[PDB]
Amino acid sequence: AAPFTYWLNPEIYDAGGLSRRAFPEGFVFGTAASAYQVEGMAKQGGRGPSIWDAFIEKPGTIPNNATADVTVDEYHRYKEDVNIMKNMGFDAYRFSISWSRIFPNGTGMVNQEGVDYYNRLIDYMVKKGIKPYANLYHYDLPLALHEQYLGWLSPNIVEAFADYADFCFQTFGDRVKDWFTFNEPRCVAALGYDNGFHAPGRCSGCDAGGNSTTEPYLAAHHLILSHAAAVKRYREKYQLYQKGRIGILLDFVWYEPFSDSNADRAAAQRARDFHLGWFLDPIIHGRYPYSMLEIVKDRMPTFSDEESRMVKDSIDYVGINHYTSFYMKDPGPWNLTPTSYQDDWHVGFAYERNGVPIGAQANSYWLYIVPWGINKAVTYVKETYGNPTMILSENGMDQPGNVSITQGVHDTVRIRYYRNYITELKKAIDDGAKVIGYFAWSLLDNFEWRLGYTSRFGIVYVDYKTLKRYPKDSAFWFKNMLS
Numbered sequence: 332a333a334p335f336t337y338w339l340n341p342e343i344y345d346a347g348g349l350s351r352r353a354f355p356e357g358f359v360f361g362t363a364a365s366a367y368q369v370e371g372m373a374k375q376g377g378r379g380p381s382i383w384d385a386f387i388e389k390p391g392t393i394p395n396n397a398t399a400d401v402t403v404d405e406y407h408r409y410k411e412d413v414n415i416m417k418n419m420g421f422d423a424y425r426f427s428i429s430w431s432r433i434f435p436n437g438t439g440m441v442n443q444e445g446v447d448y449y450n451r452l453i454d455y456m457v458k459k460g461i462k463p464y465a466n467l468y469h470y471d472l473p474l475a476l477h478e479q480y481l482g483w484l485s486p487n488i489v490e491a492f493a494d495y496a497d498f499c500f501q502t503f504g505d506r507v508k509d510w511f512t513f514n515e516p517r518c519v520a521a522l523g524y525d526n527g528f529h530a531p532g533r534c535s536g537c538d539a540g541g542n543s544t545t546e547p548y549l550a551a552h553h554l555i556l557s558h559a560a561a562v563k564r565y566r567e568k569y570q571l572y573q574k575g576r577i578g579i580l581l582d583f584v585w586y587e588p589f590s591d592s593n594a595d596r597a598a599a600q601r602a603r604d605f606h607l608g609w610f611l612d613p614i615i616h617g618r619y620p621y622s623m624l625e626i627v628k629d630r631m632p633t634f635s636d637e638e639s640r641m642v643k644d645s646i647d648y649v650g651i652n653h654y655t656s657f658y659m660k661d662p663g664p665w666n667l668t669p670t671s672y673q674d675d676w677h678v679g680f681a682y683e684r685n686g687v688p689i690g691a692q693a694n695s696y697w698l699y700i701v702p703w704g705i706n707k708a709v710t711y712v713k714e715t716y717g718n719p720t721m722i723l724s725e726n727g728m729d730q731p732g733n734v735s736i737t738q739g740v741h742d743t744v745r746i747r748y749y750r751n752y753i754t755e756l757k758k759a760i761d762d763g764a765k766v767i768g769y770f771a772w773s774l775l776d777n778f779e780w781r782l783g784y785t786s787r788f789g790i791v792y793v794d795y796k797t798l799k800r801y802p803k804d805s806a807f808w809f810k811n812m813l814s
């Protein structure tokens with residue numbers, strides 16, 4: 332790389348008063364990734380196709396028609412990556428298991444080569460002293476199950492998932508003591524079934540078909556039941572003997588009332604219900620949020636008393652993926668003709684107040700830099716859900732894909748992001764929030780779904796021509812902060 336790559340950024344040594352002592356005893360610091368975004372070997376090693384494999388095939392889906400067939404190729408360079416995490420001082424790694432790498436068809440025949448890969452990765456993490464946190468699902472439904480019965484839209488998916496989870500618990504549970512069923516089921520449901528932005532690409536307008544008024548809610552209901560069923564397998568068959576824990580990863584945008592008026596306040600609350608409460612109300616209270624039931628009515632499925640009891644308290648902790656915040660306005664009189672899940676919120680967004688932007692924007696269209704939002708978000712969870720045990724399970728920001736190694740590694744905006752968000756998180760914790768861990772998204776620049784390689788979330792720069800890794804200033808900022 333050009334000589335400027337190796338300039339020593341003094342920001343690295345500015346920890347803003349953060350250290351392991353500033354956090355609770357045994358607090359875990361990690362990084363997070365997912366199978367599809369980092370593994371490569373998409374069509375190799377016995378892996379069956381997922382809905383993203385099919386979705387990507389349609390031209391124009393991913394910028395420059397890029398694929399995740401190789402991506403950053405962690406399938407082969409997992410040792411190097413784990414070595415980087417260790418060298419940077421991280422305690423843990425949240426990865427995901429590809430359902431279709433284990434069961435090419437989703438059910439039945441186990442792909443042993445796939446199992447051997449996860450076994451290698453986990454064994455090496457353990458050997459290096461990195462704690463494995465395993466997520467079972469991160470957007471990668473086996474295509475076969477979508478072909479058979481439309482995947483998440485069928486109640487058949489529930490036991491298919493439980494069986495898959497069950498297998499993972501018995502295969503990997505002797506060393507994996509921390510499990511998650513789903514990463515961001517809200518996004519699976521909304522992006523997958525409301526606006527068709529993610530695989531399977533369904534919505535009211537969409538080429539693949541769909542109905543934005545009903546399918547997101549059906550998907551979500553089955554994801555909640557699938558989660559509950561997986562957790563039941565774990566609790567009844569494995570947990571007492573393996574002595575691990577299980578939870579779920581929920582994305583949570585902070586919604587701030589645009590003003591102190593009752594309408595704006597109620598607008599902010601309604602967005603929280605539709606975004607987070609959709610999933611966390613069932614899990615903590617056994618029921619869907621009140622606003623949702625009243626607005627969506629018959630377009631939302633109902634739990635039986637038996638399902639409600641299975642879902643309630645079906646976590647040992649909750650992962651909160653948090654990045655950003657928006658202002659929320661009452662939008663005025665509601666039009667009540669069913670349009671979409673997003674429209675069902677009946678809120679207006681705002682990104683500035685008194686000519687002042689809520690924060691600077693990162694590369695991603697949705698990502699505003701608002702450190703105080705993490706404090707509000709976590710405090711909200713503490714106060715609303717009975718102070719649950721929490722993991723701050725994703726946090727980070729992106730640069731554009733079109734930067735060189737030389738400029739890409741000097742990501743001082745990212746140092747600032749982490750310093751400020753972690754600082755705001757520390758305050759929430761200091762004020763009583765039972766946060767037990769924090770995970771940065773992500774170790775490496777990787778395949779960023781619809782944005783492909785036009786977005787760089789890593790604290791480590793990856794040259795996509797050579798797949799060489801170059802730690803950014805933010806990686807060294809962590810190494811210094813954590814030592």
Ligand SMILES: OC[C@H]1CNC[C@@H](O)[C@@H]1O
Pocket residue numbers: 365514515652725772779
């Ligand atoms: O886009 C940022 C990240 C949000 N959470 C899930 C990840 O797949 C994603 O890269």
